[PDB]
Design a binder for this molecule. Structure first.
Ligand code: HEM
Length: 395
């Protein structure tokens, strides 16, 4: 049954759209012998998978993640523990913790802007995104920006492990060395935070109680690592895509200046159009069949978020960037899956939208007469995906 189209083809990472359209039409559940996994490209099937945590569980993420996380991740948890600890993490980016974090993030943003304002250009990826994304996650958890350069050096090494399938021996040992180094840095701060309640997210995980029984320090490290990896890479890439997509559509870009309230819809449409998190794996727990494709217990299905968000069955003109989308104006609009859905849907969804709006408004207010200098982007990554560089000029 030779299927010659492959996710791992060279042309896919350059332009996955022709592969998106092919799979949804001719192979919605596509098998890749390279990693023994089926790739699900249709919106209706991805939604079904993520909303059925019993048929498609999250033990695949567990195994592949344990080496660098050192303990259990929220995705490996279920039932009361998942809810109690998810709610606990959310407390760190809501309520009073949110009101204290937001001014700091404004400062993080304005400090980056002041560094680059007098050279009349800035790289939203490499000058802002890579710096702001890691400092925001550090401010959320409660890590001092003293060592932000090395936190990034490590972070990237662990993200590679998570977002890469083919990893040789030399590449794997470095990702673990990064994990050990950051564990050596973070563990003493967890001991300090235990006695010193500074009211950050790490302190929340220490004050938490599971039937009058706090969680182990090694567990707190893994949950902190899970926040650091889940919050950094997505936020960086989304920001680059946002200003790129708007500047490539002057009408919509000017619409956003005239009505700054449209910024929330622009970010949402950006997240649908250029889904920064492209893949979500799941494990099949029992015999199941989509279309005519049979899956056996233990098979691995990989949701294709970017394809699902461009399904003609879910959106009219799905491959066009249109911030003016709405469900008021057959299935012309649907709810995208950029944050997944179901039980393991992103805890930092509301916080990501809020934080991304603050940055966009600030950039638009201080950088006057924004003009695009990177006329054509080059995107990389199939698990996490974003532009390599996105430079803009200003007065
Ligand atoms: C544009 C920004 C973001 C995007 C696109 C995104 C995407 C996602 C997606 C698709 C999932 C589902 C994973 C799965 O089903 O296995 C997820 C889960 C998660 N995200 Fe995000 N994320 C973003 C920002 C953040 C932020 C700021 C945080 C801060 C802590 C965060 C923390 C988490 C956590 C802890 C989970 C696990 C949820 C669970 O297992 O119940 N993410 N995210």
């Amino acid at each position: 049954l030779k299927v010659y189209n492959s996710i791992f083809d060279q042309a896919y990472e350059i332009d996955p759209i022709p592969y998106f359209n092919f799979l949804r039409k001719h192979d919605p559940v596509h098998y890749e012998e390279s990693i023994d996994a089926y790739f699900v490209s249709k919106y209706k099937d991805v939604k079904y998978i993520l909303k059925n945590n019993d048929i498609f569980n999250t033990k695949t993420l567990a195994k592949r993640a344990e080496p660098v996380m050192k303990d259990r991740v929220l995705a490996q948890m279920s039932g009361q523990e998942h809810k109690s600890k998810k709610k606990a993490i959310l407390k760190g980016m809501t309520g009073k913790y949110l009101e204290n974090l937001m001014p700091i993030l404004e400062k993080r943003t304005n400090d980056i802007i002041n560094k680059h304002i007098e050279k009349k250009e800035i790289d939203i990826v490499n000058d802002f995104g890579k710096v702001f994304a890691v400092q925001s996650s550090m401010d959320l958890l409660g890590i001092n920006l003293e060592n932000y350069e090395k936190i990034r050096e490590w972070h990237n090494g662990i993200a590679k492990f998570i977002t890469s399938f083919n990893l040789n021996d030399e590449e794997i040992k470095y990702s673990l060395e990064c994990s050990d180094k950051l564990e050596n840095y973070l563990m003493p701060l967890i001991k300090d935070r235990k006695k010193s309640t500074k009211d950050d997210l790490i302190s929340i995980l220490l004050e938490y109680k599971n039937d009058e029984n706090s969680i182990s320090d090694t567990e707190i490290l893994a949950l902190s690592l899970n926040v650091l990896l889940a919050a950094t890479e997505p936020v960086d890439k989304t920001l680059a895509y946002l200003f790129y997509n708007l500047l490539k559509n002057p009408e919509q870009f000017e619409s956003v200046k005239n009505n700054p309230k449209l910024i929330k819809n622009a970010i949402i449409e950006t997240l649908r159009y250029n889904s920064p998190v492209q893949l979500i794996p799941r494990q099949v727990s029992k015999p199941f069949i989509f279309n005519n494709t049979e899956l056996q217990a233990g098979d691995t299905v990989i949701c294709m978020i970017g394809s699902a968000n461009r399904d003609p069955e879910a959106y009219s003109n799905p491959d066009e960037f249109n911030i003016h989308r709405s469900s008021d104006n057959f299935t012309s609009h649907s709810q995208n899956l950029s944050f997944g859905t179901g039980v393991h849907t992103c805890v930092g969804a509301s916080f990501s939208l809020i934080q991304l709006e603050m940055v966009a408004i600030l950039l638009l207010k201080r950088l006057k007469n924004i003009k695009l200098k990177t006329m054509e982007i080059t995107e990389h990554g199939i698990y996490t995906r974003g532009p390599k560089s996105m430079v803009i000029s200003f007065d």
